[PDB]
């Protein structure tokens, strides 16, 4: 069972996560947290050329499965 | 409670088996755009041993397939015991021997990824032709004294048996503990998997989570099947 | 009055449905539904060898009375 989406870096670097509709983005960034040790204020995710917000849902973002984000650093 | 939002980490410690799997079948349940009633805070306090274990997650849902099947096998045995092509080869054998489908009908419903899926009892023929190991099954709420206690009742049904597999058959998405940053929940249509280690701790492996994890039995939602080797 | 048909499982679990010839494939896993708490999606329906589509009827399919479809879940 479940939904799969891709998270994409400029590095190229690919990996698949596991994830609901009703995620938040802030789930979202916790599973990249867990999988690669990046805390979520040092994640920018971007879909369909949009900076997703913590409080809304995949769903809100029609992210679909297979759907690609792109994540970009925040390092300052 | 009547509202869950009060209950702190600290009191779900404190609580009982039965009390935290209340909890669960209450409150666990994600709505359709959003979370449970129940935050990641709230399910850390029914998370017992943190402590290094031996026990694992040997299979990861892997990329496009829905083989749950397969890993909640390779995980409750902690080997790579089950490959994909033998996993693939006995569903199909049953499909061709037991319901008479056609060697071409069966190569398509290996072979489209996103229709594929199996059940408990394909799962129980391949546990009985692969690895001669019986198996008996149940949801957690038809076993008897359920009622009167869900962990004594799980716990007398699972016997001395080293692991389970479950089946999150239905409509609904659970919450579930985790020990790690974000919440990993309890997909509709899948499989997961328990170990019990040598201090008779189960441990939770979804192959969709990300880190193995020590609940109570109580803690499976009791619309659940239960499958135990005999 | 009316017509039944029965669904077998691998597990050997036999239930009795209350269909009419017209039922789509649809309504059938819909009664599976009510009967079991199985959601269509769950479902995977097949007689004379052949997975059967939610759009035609058993009268398409030549389902006549106490013929029996097997229901293996779609578990992922």
Redesign the interface.
């Known amino acids: 069972?479940?939904?799969?989406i891709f998270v994409k870096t400029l590095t190229g670097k690919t990996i698949?996560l596991?994830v609901?509709?009703?995620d938040?983005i802030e789930?979202v960034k916790?599973?990249i947290?867990?999988?690669e040790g990046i805390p979520p204020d040092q994640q920018r995710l971007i879909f369909a050329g949009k900076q997703l917000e913590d409080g809304r849902?995949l769903?809100?973002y029609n992210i679909q499965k297979?759907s690609t984000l792109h994540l970009v650093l925040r390092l300052r | 409670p009547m509202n869950p939002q009060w209950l702190t980490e600290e009191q779900i410690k404190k609580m009982s088996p039965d009390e935290q799997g209340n909890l669960i079948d209450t409150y666990a349940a994600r709505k359709i755009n959003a979370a449970s009633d129940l935050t990641h805070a709230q399910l850390r306090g029914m998370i017992g041993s943190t402590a290094a274990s031996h026990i694992a997650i040997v299979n990861a849902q892997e990329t496009g397939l829905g083989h749950a099947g397969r890993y909640a096998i390779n995980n409750a045995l902690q080997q790579e015991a089950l490959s994909q092509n033998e996993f693939l080869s006995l569903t199909g054998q049953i499909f061709s021997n037991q319901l008479g489908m056609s060697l071409a009908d069966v190569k398509n419903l290996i072979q489209n990824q996103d229709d594929f899926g199996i059940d408990t009892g394909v799962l129980a023929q391949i546990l009985k032709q692969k690895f001669n190991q019986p198996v008996k099954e149940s949801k957690i709420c038809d076993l008897p004294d359920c009622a009167l206690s869900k962990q004594q009742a799980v716990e007398n049904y699972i016997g001395k048996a080293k692991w389970v597999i479950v089946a999150n058959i239905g409509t609904e998405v659970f919450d579930m503990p985790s020990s790690t940053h974000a919440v990993y929940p309890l997909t509709r249509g899948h499989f997961v998997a328990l170990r019990r280690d040598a201090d008779n701790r189960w441990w939770y492996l979804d192959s969709r989570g990300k880190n193995p994890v020590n609940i109570a039995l109580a803690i499976i939602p009791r619309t659940c099947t239960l499958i135990v080797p005999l």
């Open positions: 069972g479940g939904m799969q698949t596991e609901e509709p009703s938040t789930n916790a599973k947290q867990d999988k849902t769903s809100d297979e």
